[PDB]
Coordinates of C-alpha atoms in Angstrom, one line a residue:
Chain A
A10 CA 22.4 -11.6 -8.4
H11 CA 22.7 -15.3 -9.4
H12 CA 25.1 -15.6 -12.3
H13 CA 25.8 -19.3 -12.4
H14 CA 23.8 -22.3 -13.4
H15 CA 24.4 -25.8 -12.0
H16 CA 24.5 -28.7 -14.6
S17 CA 23.8 -31.4 -12.0
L18 CA 20.6 -29.5 -11.5
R19 CA 14.8 -29.3 -13.6
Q20 CA 15.9 -32.8 -14.7
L21 CA 17.2 -32.6 -11.2
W22 CA 13.8 -33.7 -10.0
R23 CA 14.1 -37.2 -11.4
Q24 CA 16.2 -38.2 -8.4
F25 CA 13.3 -37.2 -6.2
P26 CA 10.3 -39.4 -7.3
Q27 CA 8.1 -38.6 -4.3
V28 CA 7.9 -34.9 -5.2
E29 CA 8.4 -34.9 -9.0
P30 CA 4.7 -35.4 -9.6
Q31 CA 3.7 -32.5 -7.3
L32 CA 6.3 -30.3 -9.1
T33 CA 5.1 -31.5 -12.5
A34 CA 1.5 -30.9 -11.5
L35 CA 2.4 -27.6 -9.9
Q36 CA 3.9 -26.5 -13.2
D37 CA 0.5 -27.0 -14.8
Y38 CA -1.4 -25.3 -12.0
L39 CA 1.0 -22.4 -12.4
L40 CA 0.1 -22.1 -16.1
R41 CA -3.6 -21.5 -15.1
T42 CA -3.1 -19.0 -12.2
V43 CA -2.0 -16.3 -14.7
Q44 CA -5.2 -15.0 -16.4
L45 CA -4.4 -11.9 -18.2
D46 CA -6.3 -10.1 -21.0
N47 CA -3.4 -8.9 -23.0
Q48 CA -2.8 -12.1 -24.8
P49 CA 0.7 -11.3 -26.2
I50 CA 2.0 -10.6 -22.7
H51 CA 0.0 -13.5 -21.2
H52 CA 1.8 -15.8 -23.7
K53 CA 5.2 -14.3 -22.8
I54 CA 4.7 -15.0 -19.0
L55 CA 3.5 -18.5 -19.8
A56 CA 6.7 -18.9 -21.8
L57 CA 8.8 -17.8 -18.8
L58 CA 6.9 -20.4 -16.7
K59 CA 7.1 -23.1 -19.4
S60 CA 10.8 -22.7 -20.1
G61 CA 12.0 -22.7 -16.6
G62 CA 11.4 -25.6 -14.4
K63 CA 13.5 -26.5 -11.4
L64 CA 11.0 -24.9 -9.0
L65 CA 13.7 -25.1 -6.3
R66 CA 11.7 -23.2 -3.8
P67 CA 8.5 -25.1 -4.3
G68 CA 10.6 -28.3 -4.0
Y69 CA 11.7 -27.3 -0.5
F70 CA 8.1 -26.3 0.2
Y71 CA 6.7 -29.6 -0.8
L72 CA 9.4 -31.6 1.0
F73 CA 8.6 -29.7 4.2
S74 CA 4.9 -30.3 3.7
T75 CA 5.5 -34.1 4.3
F76 CA 6.2 -33.6 8.0
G77 CA 2.4 -33.1 8.7
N78 CA -0.9 -34.2 7.5
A79 CA -3.2 -31.2 8.2
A80 CA -2.9 -29.7 4.7
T81 CA -5.4 -30.0 1.8
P82 CA -3.7 -30.5 -1.5
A83 CA -5.5 -27.4 -2.8
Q84 CA -3.8 -25.4 0.0
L85 CA -0.3 -26.8 -0.9
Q86 CA -0.6 -26.2 -4.6
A87 CA -1.6 -22.6 -3.8
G88 CA 1.2 -22.2 -1.2
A89 CA 3.8 -23.5 -3.6
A90 CA 2.5 -21.5 -6.5
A91 CA 2.5 -18.3 -4.5
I92 CA 6.2 -18.6 -3.8
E93 CA 7.1 -19.3 -7.4
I94 CA 4.9 -16.5 -8.7
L95 CA 6.5 -14.0 -6.4
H96 CA 9.9 -15.3 -7.5
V97 CA 9.1 -14.8 -11.1
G98 CA 7.6 -11.3 -10.6
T99 CA 10.8 -10.3 -9.0
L100 CA 12.9 -11.8 -11.9
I101 CA 10.8 -9.7 -14.4
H102 CA 11.6 -6.6 -12.4
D103 CA 15.3 -7.6 -12.0
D104 CA 15.6 -8.0 -15.8
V105 CA 14.2 -4.6 -16.4
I106 CA 16.6 -3.1 -13.9
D107 CA 19.6 -5.0 -15.4
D108 CA 18.2 -4.7 -18.9
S109 CA 18.9 -8.4 -19.4
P110 CA 18.1 -9.6 -22.9
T111 CA 16.9 -13.1 -22.1
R112 CA 15.7 -15.1 -19.1
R113 CA 15.5 -18.9 -19.0
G114 CA 16.4 -18.7 -22.7
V115 CA 13.3 -16.6 -23.4
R116 CA 13.5 -13.0 -24.7
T117 CA 12.6 -10.7 -21.7
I118 CA 9.4 -8.8 -21.6
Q119 CA 11.0 -5.3 -21.9
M120 CA 12.8 -6.3 -25.1
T121 CA 9.7 -7.1 -27.2
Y122 CA 7.1 -5.0 -25.3
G123 CA 9.0 -2.1 -23.6
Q124 CA 9.9 -1.3 -20.0
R125 CA 6.5 0.0 -18.9
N126 CA 4.7 -3.3 -19.9
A127 CA 7.5 -5.3 -18.3
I128 CA 7.1 -3.4 -15.0
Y129 CA 3.4 -3.7 -15.1
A130 CA 3.8 -7.5 -15.8
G131 CA 5.8 -7.9 -12.6
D132 CA 3.1 -5.8 -10.7
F133 CA 0.4 -8.1 -12.0
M134 CA 2.3 -11.1 -10.8
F135 CA 2.2 -9.6 -7.3
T136 CA -1.6 -9.6 -7.5
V137 CA -1.6 -13.2 -8.6
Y138 CA 0.8 -13.9 -5.8
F139 CA -1.4 -12.5 -3.0
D140 CA -4.4 -14.2 -4.5
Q141 CA -2.6 -17.6 -4.2
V142 CA -1.5 -16.7 -0.7
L143 CA -5.1 -16.3 0.3
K144 CA -6.2 -19.5 -1.3
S145 CA -3.5 -21.3 0.6
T146 CA -4.7 -20.5 4.1
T147 CA -7.1 -18.6 6.4
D148 CA -4.4 -18.4 9.1
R149 CA -3.7 -14.7 9.5
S150 CA -0.2 -15.2 11.0
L151 CA 0.8 -17.2 7.9
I152 CA -0.5 -14.5 5.6
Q153 CA 1.4 -11.9 7.6
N154 CA 4.4 -14.1 7.4
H155 CA 4.2 -14.0 3.6
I156 CA 3.8 -10.2 3.6
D157 CA 6.8 -9.8 6.0
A158 CA 8.9 -12.0 3.7
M159 CA 7.9 -9.9 0.6
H160 CA 8.9 -6.9 2.6
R161 CA 12.3 -8.3 3.7
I162 CA 13.2 -9.2 0.1
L163 CA 12.5 -5.7 -1.1
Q164 CA 14.5 -4.2 1.7
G165 CA 17.3 -6.7 0.8
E166 CA 17.3 -5.2 -2.7
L167 CA 17.2 -1.6 -1.4
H168 CA 20.0 -2.1 1.1
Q169 CA 22.2 -3.8 -1.6
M170 CA 21.7 -0.6 -3.6
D171 CA 22.6 1.7 -0.7
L172 CA 25.8 -0.4 -0.4
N173 CA 27.0 0.1 -4.0
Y174 CA 30.6 1.3 -4.0
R175 CA 31.0 1.1 -0.2
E176 CA 34.4 -0.2 0.5
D177 CA 33.6 -0.4 4.2
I178 CA 31.0 -3.1 3.6
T179 CA 31.0 -5.5 6.6
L180 CA 30.3 -9.2 6.8
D181 CA 27.3 -8.3 8.9
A182 CA 26.0 -6.0 6.2
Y183 CA 26.6 -8.8 3.6
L184 CA 24.7 -11.4 5.6
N185 CA 21.8 -9.1 6.3
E186 CA 21.6 -8.5 2.5
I187 CA 21.9 -12.0 1.0
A188 CA 19.6 -13.0 3.8
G189 CA 17.0 -10.7 2.4
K190 CA 17.7 -10.8 -1.3
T191 CA 18.3 -14.5 -1.5
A192 CA 17.8 -16.6 1.6
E193 CA 14.4 -15.2 2.6
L194 CA 12.4 -17.0 -0.1
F195 CA 14.0 -20.3 1.0
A196 CA 13.0 -19.7 4.6
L197 CA 9.5 -18.8 3.5
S198 CA 9.2 -22.0 1.5
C199 CA 10.4 -24.2 4.3
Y200 CA 8.2 -22.5 7.0
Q201 CA 5.0 -22.3 4.9
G202 CA 5.3 -26.0 3.7
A203 CA 5.6 -27.2 7.3
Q204 CA 3.1 -24.8 8.9
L205 CA 0.5 -25.5 6.3
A206 CA 0.7 -29.2 7.1
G207 CA 0.7 -28.7 10.8
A208 CA 4.1 -30.5 11.3
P209 CA 5.4 -30.9 14.8
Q210 CA 6.8 -27.9 16.6
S211 CA 10.3 -29.4 16.5
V212 CA 10.1 -29.2 12.7
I213 CA 8.5 -25.8 12.5
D214 CA 11.1 -24.3 14.8
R215 CA 13.9 -25.5 12.5
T216 CA 12.5 -24.5 9.1
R217 CA 13.5 -20.9 9.0
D218 CA 17.0 -21.6 10.2
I219 CA 17.4 -24.3 7.6
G220 CA 16.0 -22.0 4.7
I221 CA 18.2 -19.1 5.8
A222 CA 21.3 -21.2 6.1
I223 CA 20.7 -22.8 2.7
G224 CA 19.9 -19.6 1.0
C225 CA 23.0 -17.9 2.4
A226 CA 25.3 -20.7 1.3
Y227 CA 23.6 -20.7 -2.1
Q228 CA 24.3 -16.9 -2.6
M229 CA 27.9 -17.4 -1.3
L230 CA 28.6 -20.2 -3.9
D231 CA 27.5 -17.9 -6.7
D232 CA 29.8 -15.2 -5.4
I233 CA 32.6 -17.7 -5.1
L234 CA 32.1 -18.6 -8.8
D235 CA 32.5 -15.0 -9.7
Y236 CA 36.2 -15.0 -8.7
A237 CA 37.2 -18.6 -9.0
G238 CA 39.7 -20.0 -11.5
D239 CA 42.1 -17.8 -13.5
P240 CA 42.4 -14.1 -12.4
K241 CA 43.6 -13.2 -15.9
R242 CA 40.3 -14.5 -17.2
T243 CA 37.2 -12.4 -17.0
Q244 CA 33.4 -12.8 -16.8
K245 CA 31.0 -10.2 -18.1
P246 CA 28.6 -10.2 -15.1
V247 CA 31.6 -9.8 -12.8
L248 CA 33.0 -7.0 -14.9
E249 CA 29.5 -5.3 -14.7
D250 CA 29.2 -5.8 -11.0
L251 CA 32.6 -4.1 -10.2
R252 CA 31.8 -1.1 -12.3
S253 CA 28.4 -0.9 -10.6
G254 CA 30.0 -1.1 -7.2
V255 CA 28.9 -4.6 -6.3
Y256 CA 31.6 -6.3 -4.3
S257 CA 30.8 -10.0 -3.9
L258 CA 32.0 -12.2 -1.1
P259 CA 35.6 -13.1 -2.2
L260 CA 36.3 -9.4 -2.9
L261 CA 34.5 -8.2 0.2
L262 CA 36.7 -10.5 2.3
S263 CA 39.9 -9.3 0.6
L264 CA 39.5 -5.5 1.0
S265 CA 41.0 -5.2 4.4
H266 CA 44.2 -6.9 3.2
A267 CA 45.0 -3.9 1.1
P268 CA 42.3 -1.2 1.3
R269 CA 44.4 1.5 -0.5
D270 CA 45.4 -0.8 -3.4
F271 CA 41.8 -1.9 -3.9
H272 CA 40.6 1.7 -3.6
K273 CA 42.9 3.0 -6.3
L274 CA 41.1 0.6 -8.7
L275 CA 37.5 0.4 -7.4
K276 CA 37.1 4.2 -7.1
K277 CA 37.0 4.5 -10.9
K278 CA 33.6 2.9 -10.9
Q279 CA 32.2 2.8 -14.4
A280 CA 35.5 4.1 -15.7
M281 CA 37.2 0.9 -14.5
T282 CA 39.3 -0.4 -17.4
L283 CA 39.7 -4.1 -18.1
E284 CA 43.2 -3.9 -16.8
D285 CA 41.8 -2.4 -13.6
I286 CA 39.4 -5.4 -13.3
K287 CA 42.1 -8.0 -13.7
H288 CA 44.3 -6.2 -11.1
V289 CA 41.3 -6.5 -8.7
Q290 CA 41.1 -10.2 -9.5
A291 CA 44.8 -10.6 -9.0
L292 CA 44.6 -9.0 -5.5
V293 CA 41.6 -11.3 -4.6
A294 CA 43.8 -14.2 -5.7
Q295 CA 46.8 -12.9 -3.8
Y296 CA 44.8 -12.7 -0.6
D297 CA 42.9 -15.9 -1.3
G298 CA 39.4 -14.2 -1.1
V299 CA 38.0 -17.4 -2.7
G300 CA 39.4 -19.8 -0.1
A301 CA 38.0 -17.5 2.7
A302 CA 34.6 -17.3 1.0
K303 CA 34.7 -21.1 0.6
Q304 CA 35.1 -21.8 4.3
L305 CA 32.1 -19.6 5.1
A306 CA 29.9 -21.3 2.4
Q307 CA 31.0 -24.7 3.9
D308 CA 30.1 -23.7 7.4
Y309 CA 26.7 -22.4 6.4
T310 CA 26.2 -25.5 4.3
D311 CA 27.1 -27.8 7.3
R312 CA 24.8 -25.8 9.6
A313 CA 21.9 -26.5 7.2
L314 CA 22.8 -30.2 7.0
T315 CA 23.1 -30.5 10.7
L316 CA 19.7 -29.0 11.2
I317 CA 18.2 -31.3 8.5
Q318 CA 19.7 -34.3 10.3
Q319 CA 17.6 -33.3 13.4
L320 CA 14.4 -33.7 11.4
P321 CA 12.2 -36.8 11.8
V322 CA 13.7 -39.8 10.0
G323 CA 12.3 -40.8 6.7
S324 CA 12.0 -40.3 3.1
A325 CA 11.6 -36.5 3.2
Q326 CA 14.5 -36.0 5.6
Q327 CA 16.6 -38.0 3.3
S328 CA 15.4 -36.1 0.2
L329 CA 16.1 -32.8 1.9
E330 CA 19.6 -33.8 2.7
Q331 CA 20.2 -35.1 -0.8
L332 CA 18.7 -32.0 -2.4
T333 CA 20.8 -29.7 -0.2
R334 CA 24.1 -31.5 -0.8
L335 CA 23.4 -31.3 -4.5
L336 CA 22.4 -27.7 -4.6
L337 CA 25.3 -26.7 -2.4
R338 CA 27.9 -28.9 -4.1
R339 CA 28.8 -30.9 -1.0
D340 CA 28.3 -34.5 -2.1
Chain B
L20 CA -9.4 22.1 -3.5
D21 CA -6.8 23.8 -1.2
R22 CA -4.9 21.1 0.8
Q23 CA -6.9 22.7 3.7
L24 CA -10.1 21.1 2.2
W25 CA -10.8 18.9 5.2
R26 CA -11.5 21.9 7.4
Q27 CA -14.9 22.0 5.8
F28 CA -15.6 18.4 6.9
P29 CA -14.9 18.5 10.6
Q30 CA -16.4 15.1 11.4
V31 CA -13.6 13.4 9.4
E32 CA -10.8 16.0 9.9
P33 CA -9.3 14.3 12.8
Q34 CA -9.0 11.0 10.9
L35 CA -7.6 12.7 7.7
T36 CA -5.1 14.6 9.8
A37 CA -4.0 11.5 11.6
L38 CA -3.8 9.6 8.3
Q39 CA -1.4 12.1 6.7
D40 CA 1.1 11.5 9.6
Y41 CA 0.5 7.8 9.6
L42 CA 1.2 7.5 5.9
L43 CA 4.4 9.5 6.2
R44 CA 5.6 7.3 9.0
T45 CA 4.5 4.2 7.2
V46 CA 6.4 4.9 3.9
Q47 CA 9.6 6.0 5.7
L48 CA 12.7 4.7 4.0
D49 CA 16.6 5.0 4.1
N50 CA 17.1 5.6 0.4
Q51 CA 16.4 9.2 -0.3
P52 CA 16.0 9.1 -4.0
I53 CA 13.4 6.4 -3.7
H54 CA 11.7 8.0 -0.6
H55 CA 11.5 11.2 -2.6
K56 CA 9.6 9.4 -5.4
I57 CA 7.1 8.6 -2.7
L58 CA 7.2 11.8 -0.7
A59 CA 6.5 13.9 -3.7
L60 CA 3.1 12.3 -4.2
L61 CA 2.3 12.4 -0.4
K62 CA 3.0 16.2 -0.2
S63 CA 2.0 17.6 -3.6
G64 CA -1.3 17.5 -5.6
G65 CA -4.7 16.4 -4.2
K66 CA -4.8 15.7 -0.5
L67 CA -6.3 12.3 0.5
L68 CA -9.3 12.7 -1.8
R69 CA -10.0 8.9 -2.0
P70 CA -9.5 8.5 1.8
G71 CA -11.9 11.4 2.3
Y72 CA -14.7 9.4 0.5
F73 CA -13.6 6.3 2.5
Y74 CA -13.9 8.0 5.8
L75 CA -17.2 9.9 5.0
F76 CA -18.8 6.5 4.1
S77 CA -17.3 5.0 7.3
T78 CA -19.4 7.4 9.4
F79 CA -22.5 5.2 8.5
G80 CA -21.1 2.4 10.6
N81 CA -19.2 1.7 13.8
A82 CA -17.9 -1.8 13.3
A83 CA -14.2 -1.1 12.8
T84 CA -11.5 0.3 15.2
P85 CA -9.9 3.6 14.3
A86 CA -6.6 1.7 13.7
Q87 CA -8.4 -0.7 11.2
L88 CA -10.1 2.2 9.4
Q89 CA -6.8 4.0 9.2
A90 CA -5.1 1.0 7.6
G91 CA -8.0 0.7 5.2
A92 CA -7.7 4.4 4.2
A93 CA -3.9 4.1 4.0
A94 CA -4.1 1.1 1.8
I95 CA -6.1 2.9 -0.8
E96 CA -3.8 6.0 -0.9
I97 CA -0.8 3.6 -1.0
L98 CA -2.1 1.7 -3.9
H99 CA -2.9 5.1 -5.6
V100 CA 0.7 6.3 -5.0
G101 CA 2.2 2.9 -6.1
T102 CA 0.5 3.0 -9.4
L103 CA 1.4 6.7 -10.0
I104 CA 5.1 6.0 -9.5
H105 CA 5.1 3.1 -11.9
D106 CA 3.0 5.1 -14.4
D107 CA 6.1 7.4 -14.5
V108 CA 8.3 4.7 -16.0
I109 CA 9.5 5.3 -19.6
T110 CA 17.9 5.6 -15.9
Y111 CA 19.5 5.0 -12.5
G112 CA 16.4 7.0 -11.3
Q113 CA 14.4 4.3 -13.1
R114 CA 15.8 1.8 -10.6
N115 CA 14.1 4.3 -8.3
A116 CA 10.6 4.3 -9.7
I117 CA 10.6 0.5 -10.0
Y118 CA 11.7 0.0 -6.4
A119 CA 9.7 2.8 -5.0
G120 CA 6.5 1.3 -6.7
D121 CA 7.4 -2.2 -5.4
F122 CA 7.9 -1.0 -1.9
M123 CA 4.4 0.6 -2.0
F124 CA 2.8 -2.7 -3.1
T125 CA 4.3 -4.6 -0.2
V126 CA 3.1 -1.9 2.3
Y127 CA -0.3 -2.0 0.5
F128 CA -0.9 -5.7 1.3
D129 CA 0.3 -5.2 4.8
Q130 CA -2.2 -2.4 5.3
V131 CA -5.0 -4.3 3.7
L132 CA -4.5 -7.2 6.1
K133 CA -4.2 -4.8 9.0
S134 CA -7.6 -3.3 8.1
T135 CA -9.7 -6.5 8.2
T136 CA -10.1 -10.2 9.1
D137 CA -12.8 -10.5 6.5
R138 CA -11.5 -12.6 3.6
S139 CA -13.9 -11.2 1.0
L140 CA -12.9 -7.6 1.7
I141 CA -9.2 -8.6 1.2
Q142 CA -10.2 -10.4 -2.1
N143 CA -12.1 -7.2 -3.0
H144 CA -8.8 -5.3 -2.8
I145 CA -6.8 -7.8 -4.8
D146 CA -9.4 -7.9 -7.5
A147 CA -9.4 -4.1 -7.8
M148 CA -5.6 -4.0 -8.1
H149 CA -5.9 -6.8 -10.6
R150 CA -8.4 -4.8 -12.7
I151 CA -6.3 -1.7 -12.5
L152 CA -3.1 -3.4 -13.6
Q153 CA -4.9 -5.4 -16.4
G154 CA -6.1 -2.0 -17.5
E155 CA -2.6 -0.6 -17.5
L156 CA -1.4 -3.5 -19.7
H157 CA -4.0 -2.6 -22.4
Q158 CA -2.6 0.9 -22.9
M159 CA 0.2 0.2 -25.3
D160 CA -2.5 -1.3 -27.6
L161 CA -4.8 1.8 -27.4
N162 CA -2.1 4.4 -27.9
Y163 CA -2.2 6.0 -31.4
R164 CA -5.6 4.5 -32.1
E165 CA -7.7 7.1 -34.0
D166 CA -10.7 4.7 -34.3
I167 CA -11.1 4.4 -30.5
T168 CA -14.8 4.4 -29.6
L169 CA -16.4 6.3 -26.6
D170 CA -17.1 2.8 -25.2
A171 CA -13.5 1.8 -25.2
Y172 CA -12.4 5.2 -23.6
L173 CA -15.1 4.7 -20.8
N174 CA -14.1 1.2 -20.2
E175 CA -10.4 1.6 -20.4
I176 CA -9.6 5.2 -19.3
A177 CA -12.4 6.7 -17.2
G178 CA -13.3 3.2 -15.8
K179 CA -9.8 2.5 -14.6
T180 CA -9.6 5.7 -12.7
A181 CA -13.0 4.9 -11.2
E182 CA -11.7 1.7 -9.6
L183 CA -10.0 3.4 -6.7
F184 CA -13.0 5.7 -6.1
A185 CA -15.4 2.7 -6.0
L186 CA -12.9 0.8 -3.8
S187 CA -12.8 3.8 -1.4
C188 CA -16.5 4.1 -0.9
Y189 CA -17.1 0.4 -0.8
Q190 CA -14.4 -0.5 1.8
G191 CA -15.2 2.5 4.0
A192 CA -18.8 1.4 4.3
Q193 CA -18.0 -2.4 4.6
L194 CA -15.3 -2.1 7.2
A195 CA -17.5 0.2 9.4
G196 CA -20.4 -2.2 8.9
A197 CA -22.7 0.4 7.4
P198 CA -26.2 -0.9 6.5
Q199 CA -26.6 -3.0 3.3
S200 CA -28.7 -0.2 1.9
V201 CA -25.6 2.1 2.0
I202 CA -23.1 -0.6 0.9
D203 CA -25.2 -1.5 -2.1
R204 CA -24.9 2.1 -3.4
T205 CA -21.2 2.7 -2.8
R206 CA -19.7 1.2 -6.0
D207 CA -22.3 2.9 -8.3
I208 CA -21.5 6.2 -6.6
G209 CA -17.7 5.8 -6.7
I210 CA -17.7 4.7 -10.3
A211 CA -19.7 7.7 -11.5
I212 CA -17.5 10.1 -9.5
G213 CA -14.3 8.5 -10.6
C214 CA -15.3 8.6 -14.3
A215 CA -16.5 12.2 -14.1
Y216 CA -13.2 13.1 -12.4
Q217 CA -11.1 11.6 -15.2
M218 CA -13.3 13.3 -17.9
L219 CA -12.9 16.7 -16.1
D220 CA -9.1 16.3 -16.1
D221 CA -9.3 15.5 -19.9
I222 CA -11.4 18.6 -20.4
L223 CA -8.7 20.7 -18.8
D224 CA -6.1 19.4 -21.3
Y225 CA -7.9 21.4 -24.0
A226 CA -10.1 24.0 -22.1
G227 CA -7.4 25.2 -19.7
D228 CA -5.4 28.3 -20.5
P229 CA -2.8 27.2 -23.0
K230 CA -0.4 28.9 -20.6
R231 CA 0.3 25.5 -19.1
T232 CA -1.8 22.9 -21.0
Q233 CA 0.2 22.4 -24.2
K234 CA 3.3 21.1 -22.3
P235 CA 1.8 17.8 -20.9
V236 CA -0.7 17.6 -23.8
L237 CA 2.2 17.8 -26.3
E238 CA 3.6 14.7 -24.4
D239 CA 0.4 12.8 -24.4
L240 CA -0.1 13.4 -28.1
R241 CA 3.4 12.4 -29.1
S242 CA 2.7 9.2 -27.1
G243 CA -0.6 8.5 -28.8
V244 CA -2.8 9.4 -25.8
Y245 CA -5.9 11.2 -27.0
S246 CA -8.1 12.6 -24.2
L247 CA -11.8 12.9 -24.3
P248 CA -12.2 16.3 -26.1
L249 CA -9.8 15.1 -28.9
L250 CA -11.5 11.7 -29.1
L251 CA -14.9 13.4 -29.5
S252 CA -13.5 15.8 -32.3
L253 CA -11.9 13.2 -34.6
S254 CA -15.1 12.3 -36.5
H255 CA -15.6 15.9 -37.6
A256 CA -12.4 15.9 -39.6
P257 CA -10.7 12.5 -39.4
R258 CA -8.1 13.2 -42.2
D259 CA -7.1 16.6 -40.9
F260 CA -6.4 15.1 -37.4
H261 CA -4.6 12.0 -38.8
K262 CA -2.2 14.3 -40.7
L263 CA -0.9 15.7 -37.4
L264 CA -1.3 12.7 -35.1
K265 CA 0.5 10.3 -37.4
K266 CA 3.9 12.1 -36.7
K267 CA 3.7 10.5 -33.2
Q268 CA 6.9 11.4 -31.2
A269 CA 7.9 13.6 -34.1
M270 CA 4.9 15.9 -33.6
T271 CA 6.0 19.6 -33.1
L272 CA 4.7 22.5 -31.1
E273 CA 3.0 23.8 -34.2
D274 CA 1.3 20.4 -34.8
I275 CA -0.1 20.4 -31.2
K276 CA -1.3 24.1 -31.6
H277 CA -3.1 22.9 -34.7
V278 CA -4.7 19.8 -33.0
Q279 CA -5.8 22.2 -30.2
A280 CA -7.2 24.6 -32.8
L281 CA -9.3 21.9 -34.4
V282 CA -10.6 20.6 -31.0
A283 CA -11.9 24.2 -30.3
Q284 CA -13.4 24.5 -33.9
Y285 CA -15.2 21.2 -33.6
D286 CA -16.3 21.7 -29.9
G287 CA -14.7 18.6 -28.4
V288 CA -14.7 20.4 -25.0
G289 CA -18.4 21.1 -25.2
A290 CA -19.1 17.5 -26.1
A291 CA -16.8 16.3 -23.3
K292 CA -18.5 18.6 -20.7
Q293 CA -22.0 17.3 -21.6
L294 CA -20.9 13.7 -21.1
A295 CA -19.0 14.6 -17.9
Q296 CA -22.2 16.4 -16.7
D297 CA -24.3 13.2 -17.1
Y298 CA -21.9 11.3 -14.8
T299 CA -21.8 14.1 -12.3
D300 CA -25.6 14.4 -12.2
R301 CA -25.8 10.6 -11.8
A302 CA -23.3 10.8 -8.9
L303 CA -25.3 13.5 -7.1
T304 CA -28.6 11.6 -7.7
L305 CA -27.2 8.5 -6.1
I306 CA -25.8 10.4 -3.2
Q307 CA -29.3 11.9 -2.7
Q308 CA -30.6 8.4 -2.3
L309 CA -28.4 7.7 0.8
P310 CA -30.0 8.1 4.3
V311 CA -30.4 11.8 5.0
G312 CA -28.0 13.4 7.4
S313 CA -24.4 14.6 8.0
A314 CA -22.7 11.9 5.9
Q315 CA -25.0 12.4 2.9
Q316 CA -24.6 16.2 3.0
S317 CA -20.9 16.0 3.3
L318 CA -20.6 13.5 0.4
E319 CA -22.7 15.8 -1.7
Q320 CA -20.6 18.9 -0.8
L321 CA -17.4 17.0 -1.5
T322 CA -18.6 15.8 -4.8
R323 CA -19.9 19.2 -5.9
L324 CA -16.6 20.7 -5.0
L325 CA -14.6 18.0 -6.8
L326 CA -16.7 18.0 -9.9
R327 CA -17.2 21.8 -10.1
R328 CA -21.0 21.6 -9.7
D329 CA -21.2 24.1 -6.9

């Protein structure tokens, strides 16, 4: 999950004047894609859309669209909207599963209207998503690419679940997970923006590696924030993760330093006491799990930036580098 | 309706046999608790009824490959199963229903695409799923309503169930490239069948031996779900029903026996059967308008079997 919000980041779009209009306009288009008869739930979804801007994934999509001229603006707005609607559908379901009270400062659907309606609201967003996908293109490979992405995300979520409480979790298994659960929508955004615009092969062939690298680093930075600072201190989400068997990157990297000591604590699962939690954090600090996670996030970040520096020179290249350095805190 | 049903329809038996195995392979999954959510619906209950209508209608055409047809038929059963799993939601197992459902929707779209390069047939699927989910989102509002009209029930209860039946007949004929004559009748046929089918199930809530009915009916009533024979009985004694139904989740076994007793007194089952019979008759009449031959005869036999008009 993504527990941390970046201050430097919707107002973030002011620094990107060439795509702020598209994103501002997409926001309005987004408000009209959702036509639903149950007016109370329709209003709630609108409220989720209204209250949360940022539109990070549509941003990367629109930036990548600049490398080509083959796209109609109707296609691009539908392509960007598809990505964001899928994203929001998956958030609605995540919040049911986490029973989160609020999202984007809005009370979640299941709180006011119950779990069934919340689940069906997500499902309805999937139909809106596929409708927007079709509007965006008649290219069968690009539609399949969307479907395949939607599939990898769901597999990402299922494999993360299979992995709960596994103290033999590997870096390979972590990458394959945060690739699916997090990075895949970034890859999809970059690839579809560029493809839809018929950008040059050289660009197309880099989009997925860029999106994957960014999305991985992005998930790692959130994990790093879970264990950073004072090990005596505690964060609710982190406390809930450990009881639920979710070992994020700094812990994952620390396990092998003292598997029996971590196991004495982790095995208590939901029964883990607050003292237990702090002891876990003290071991992560002792073995510098955070410094290890940081080197990996930095290498993934630099891989993204290196690939971005190989794109065609110009405003979009420069905007992509600036956006990535900002998102991944590497200014 | 033994799960051996398709033995009586040999011209589609090889495709229905191949579909069952294709479906199983298609929905394979690591997580067992989630897989089992799925596997339960693929192994129990009615066997490939909607795909049966799909394939019978496909024998009017030869435009699609067997692989395309098979993805078309799978998509309908997958959507059916996806919605059934989510309809179960009310909890670690609840993680399971949600993800199992979501998994089915992603396989759904994949199969839809695999079935056709025709954009309007793809849109036809999305629109159907849209209507179904919109319908699901109206339910909370209908529950506990004792002023519900027959019109609302038909639109919101029978009509929703009808969607997958209409979708089946329509896509089977369209993908195979049946003549327009046939295509033009498919939705009217599937809607009448699907509505009759839902009504018959409702009839069984109150006409079936109480040996096993009152269990799930007790749950429906506590939840504010009033099936056709109850709906059609309310007007004969609105206050006497209200007195029981207003206890909602607090309703007892004696309160449900009482509701059941009043439905029998006021002939809700008889009223429901007469209306169901109109829809069944209509279905059979429309099927008798199709070109004469093997597909027509089989569609008739299947429909008479399903709607107990044999």
